[PDB]
Write an enzyme that holds these catalytic residues in place. Sequence first.
Site, PDB file in Angstrom:
ATOM      1  N   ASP A  35       0.776  -1.561   0.194  1.00 11.59           N
ATOM      2  CA  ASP A  35      -0.142  -0.292   0.201  1.00 11.59           C
ATOM      3  C   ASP A  35       0.469   1.072   0.094  1.00 11.59           C
ATOM      4  O   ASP A  35       1.410   1.096   1.067  1.00 11.59           O
ATOM      5  CB  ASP A  35      -0.563   0.084   1.534  1.00 11.59           C
ATOM      6  CG  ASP A  35      -2.043   1.030   1.420  1.00 11.59           C
ATOM      7  OD1 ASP A  35      -1.969   1.405   0.065  1.00 11.59           O
ATOM      8  OD2 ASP A  35      -2.253   1.486   2.432  1.00 11.59           O
ATOM      9  N   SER A 198      -1.123  15.831 -12.287  1.00 15.98           N
ATOM     10  CA  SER A 198      -1.226  15.192 -13.765  1.00 15.98           C
ATOM     11  C   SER A 198      -1.298  16.802 -14.916  1.00 15.98           C
ATOM     12  O   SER A 198      -2.330  17.703 -13.714  1.00 15.98           O
ATOM     13  CB  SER A 198      -2.592  14.442 -13.578  1.00 15.98           C
ATOM     14  OG  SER A 198      -3.051  13.791 -15.236  1.00 15.98           O
TER      15      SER A 198
HETATM   16  C1  LIG Z   1     -13.739  -3.393  -2.284  1.00 20.00           C
HETATM   17  C2  LIG Z   1     -14.389  -1.120  -3.484  1.00 20.00           C
HETATM   18  C3  LIG Z   1     -15.930  -1.439  -2.819  1.00 20.00           C
HETATM   19  C4  LIG Z   1     -12.777  -1.047  -4.536  1.00 20.00           C
HETATM   20  S1  LIG Z   1     -12.685  -0.390  -1.409  1.00 20.00           S
HETATM   21  O1  LIG Z   1     -12.849   1.468  -1.771  1.00 20.00           O
HETATM   22  O2  LIG Z   1     -13.958  -1.263  -0.481  1.00 20.00           O
HETATM   23  N1  LIG Z   1     -12.020  -1.555  -1.186  1.00 20.00           N
HETATM   24  C5  LIG Z   1     -10.342  -0.841  -0.986  1.00 20.00           C
HETATM   25  C6  LIG Z   1      -9.649  -1.834  -1.442  1.00 20.00           C
HETATM   26  C7  LIG Z   1      -9.762  -2.903  -0.786  1.00 20.00           C
HETATM   27  C8  LIG Z   1      -9.861  -4.226  -1.387  1.00 20.00           C
HETATM   28  C9  LIG Z   1      -9.852  -5.649  -0.886  1.00 20.00           C
HETATM   29  C10 LIG Z   1     -10.099  -5.587   0.921  1.00 20.00           C
HETATM   30  C11 LIG Z   1     -10.065  -4.634   1.090  1.00 20.00           C
HETATM   31  C12 LIG Z   1      -9.786  -3.402   0.481  1.00 20.00           C
HETATM   32  C13 LIG Z   1      -9.989   0.785  -1.253  1.00 20.00           C
HETATM   33  O3  LIG Z   1      -9.759   1.040  -2.168  1.00 20.00           O
HETATM   34  N2  LIG Z   1      -9.679   1.285   0.246  1.00 20.00           N
HETATM   35  C14 LIG Z   1      -9.618   2.518   0.448  1.00 20.00           C
HETATM   36  C15 LIG Z   1     -10.339   3.791   0.436  1.00 20.00           C
HETATM   37  C16 LIG Z   1     -10.343   4.788   0.216  1.00 20.00           C
HETATM   38  C17 LIG Z   1      -9.108   5.823   0.167  1.00 20.00           C
HETATM   39  N3  LIG Z   1      -9.218   7.012   0.778  1.00 20.00           N
HETATM   40  C18 LIG Z   1     -11.160   7.656   1.056  1.00 20.00           C
HETATM   41  N4  LIG Z   1     -11.436   5.957   0.340  1.00 20.00           N
HETATM   42  C19 LIG Z   1      -8.625   2.429   1.463  1.00 20.00           C
HETATM   43  O4  LIG Z   1      -8.865   2.822   2.357  1.00 20.00           O
HETATM   44  N5  LIG Z   1      -7.321   2.822   0.876  1.00 20.00           N
HETATM   45  C20 LIG Z   1      -6.100   2.418   2.091  1.00 20.00           C
HETATM   46  C21 LIG Z   1      -5.493   0.794   2.026  1.00 20.00           C
HETATM   47  C22 LIG Z   1      -6.118  -0.626   2.108  1.00 20.00           C
HETATM   48  C23 LIG Z   1      -7.367  -0.254   3.298  1.00 20.00           C
HETATM   49  C24 LIG Z   1      -8.114  -1.418   3.787  1.00 20.00           C
HETATM   50  C25 LIG Z   1      -7.886  -2.721   3.135  1.00 20.00           C
HETATM   51  C26 LIG Z   1      -7.050  -2.779   1.863  1.00 20.00           C
HETATM   52  C27 LIG Z   1      -5.739  -1.720   2.312  1.00 20.00           C
HETATM   53  C28 LIG Z   1      -5.188   3.680   1.638  1.00 20.00           C
HETATM   54  O5  LIG Z   1      -4.379   2.696   3.019  1.00 20.00           O
HETATM   55  O6  LIG Z   1      -4.363   3.130   0.755  1.00 20.00           O
HETATM   56  C29 LIG Z   1      -5.137   5.053   2.195  1.00 20.00           C
HETATM   57  F1  LIG Z   1      -3.986   5.716   1.247  1.00 20.00           F
HETATM   58  F2  LIG Z   1      -6.416   5.055   0.817  1.00 20.00           F
HETATM   59  C30 LIG Z   1      -5.735   5.209   3.095  1.00 20.00           C
HETATM   60  O7  LIG Z   1      -6.062   5.832   4.074  1.00 20.00           O
HETATM   61  N6  LIG Z   1      -4.673   6.154   3.945  1.00 20.00           N
HETATM   62  C31 LIG Z   1      -4.093   6.439   5.056  1.00 20.00           C
HETATM   63  C32 LIG Z   1      -3.440   7.306   5.488  1.00 20.00           C
HETATM   64  N7  LIG Z   1      -2.845   6.997   7.548  1.00 20.00           N
HETATM   65  C33 LIG Z   1      -4.376   7.687   7.899  1.00 20.00           C
HETATM   66  C34 LIG Z   1      -4.222   7.425   9.141  1.00 20.00           C
HETATM   67  O8  LIG Z   1      -2.512   8.592   9.267  1.00 20.00           O
HETATM   68  C35 LIG Z   1      -1.700   7.769   8.520  1.00 20.00           C
HETATM   69  C36 LIG Z   1      -1.827   8.015   7.224  1.00 20.00           C
END
Ligand SMILES: CC(C)(C)S(=O)(=O)N[C@@H](Cc1ccccc1)C(=O)N[C@@H](Cc1c[nH]c[nH+]1)C(=O)N[C@@H](CC1CCCCC1)C(O)(O)C(F)(F)C(=O)NCCN1CCOCC1
Length: 329
Positions: A35, A198
Amino acid sequence: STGSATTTPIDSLDDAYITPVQIGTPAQTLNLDFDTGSSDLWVFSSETTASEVXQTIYTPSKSTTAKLLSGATWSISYGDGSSSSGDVYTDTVSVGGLTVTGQAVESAKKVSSSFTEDSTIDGLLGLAFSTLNTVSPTQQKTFFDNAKASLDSPVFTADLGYHAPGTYNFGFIDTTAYTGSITYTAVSTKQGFWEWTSTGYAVGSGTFKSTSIDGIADTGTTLLYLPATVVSAYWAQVSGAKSSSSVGGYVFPCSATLPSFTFGVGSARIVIPGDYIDFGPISTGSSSCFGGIQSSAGIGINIFGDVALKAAFVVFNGATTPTLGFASK
Ligand SMILES: CC(C)(C)S(=O)(=O)N[C@@H](Cc1ccccc1)C(=O)N[C@@H](Cc1c[nH]c[nH+]1)C(=O)N[C@@H](CC1CCCCC1)C(O)(O)C(F)(F)C(=O)NCCN1CCOCC1
């Protein structure tokens, strides 16, 4: 040194990709979600609340090289609302043959329901900048930050496949994996992300509009999230597409042939084939499919997620002044 690992989609939709990681001595192999949108390496483990485990766990007490990092804890939440927390060990971690000693391995004491329900992901390997790491009181470096001193070159590359395996490489650029040349663009690290701008977009065979789109290159996000007016311009070219409030975004008839979508990287152009934007049917046997390009307005940041990155060969250049490189493939 260098490393090379195969990454594989977790399901038929390319919802996420997993990559095997060896942790500890003797190695325990876990499948982690690489990630570039976060900076914590955390795993399901023998410490995780049993009712919340369904995944391969790390057991620090069977690793001779594991060391508890005294008094350190971690807690993280992601944009989709999922969360986890726990304590911290250091241990040996290997990816694709590249070994790092002394890597912080965050062991989950608790995980949210979404994590429990996804049997295919055993944890996360964060590859954003270390300023986003959630360990307290002292933040821990990411796998990439720890490997840079040993790497042949301070880079890693992402070559994600469309309904197919791909590759994560550490420390070298495979010139056989892309076509043409790589175009590099500046990265802003102010928010801790691989954040870039972009230079514009085009829909199908139409005109390229120069308009700056600030966003992040995020392997850990499935879809392509763009400004509402760019997204409306895309779906206007799809006769049966509509925004559905019950499903949560744009939907269209699965039978449609979708236009490509082009985004600018400097003077270069990356073309996402229409088929990549067909995420899939909203449910098995449905006549309606979910779109792979959606509005970022609710998120607050534009995200170049897997739908976009899998159309390109992507270079994460980790030099003191970082840059992002894109090539067609
Ligand atoms: C199965 C969609 C019906 C296509 S969904 O959005 O739910 N898919 C999820 C990914 C997924 C696939 C399969 C199983 C589980 C999860 C998705 O794309 N999640 C994004 C949605 C999002 C981003 N922003 C707003 N909404 C996300 O949170 N991605 C984070 C990583 C994911 C988290 C769930 C598990 C898989 C890894 C992420 O890290 O990429 C991030 F960048 F979006 C994020 O949350 N970054 C966290 C930043 N942290 C915050 C705390 O302080 C430190 C910095």
